[PDB]
């Protein structure tokens with residue numbers, strides 16, 4: 001049979017937190033992603049029009065710590081949401097877009113063997 005595995009939040013934290021840590025350890029590349037974008041402080045008033053579902057590393061980390069992910073796919077979705085938001089909002093020539101691309105390469109490398117082990 002093809003059984004759907006049940007995951008406990010503390011098990012997801014142990015398995016998935018290292019993949020998030022790998023993003024945070026990229027410096028300077030993770031710096032734009034460590035806290036929610038504040039459009040007022042960054043002077044980008046159109047941000048929340050373009051980005052309907054903001055996401056950032058601090059939110060993902062707190063969701064892992066506090067057990068808000070029932071399934072690993074939800075964590076993976078939040079990470080790709082964060083990256084796709086940044087590629088959407090920022091220009092291809094921009095520092096943040098290029099940092100995003102680096103983080104996404106790191107994430108793809110880290111998430112695949114972890115998800116295979118899960």
Ligand SMILES: CCOc1ccc(C(C)=O)cc1-c1cccc(-c2nn[nH]n2)c1
Nearest residue numbers: 017018020021024025026034057058061
């Ligand atoms: C909430 C802010 O989190 C961070 C901030 C900065 C940095 C840096 C400087 O690298 C790392 C984290 C972070 C994140 C998740 C896991 C871990 C971690 N878990 N076990 N070892 N490291 C470390």
Ligand SMILES: CCOc1ccc(C(C)=O)cc1-c1cccc(-c2nn[nH]n2)c1
Nearest residue numbers: 028031032033037042085086089090096
């Ligand atoms: C100067 C333009 O900032 C941004 C533009 C877009 C976005 C996003 C994620 O779409 C993020 C930031 C941002 C936010 C906080 C810190 C930093 C930062 N701190 N050190 N280096 N970069 C960069």
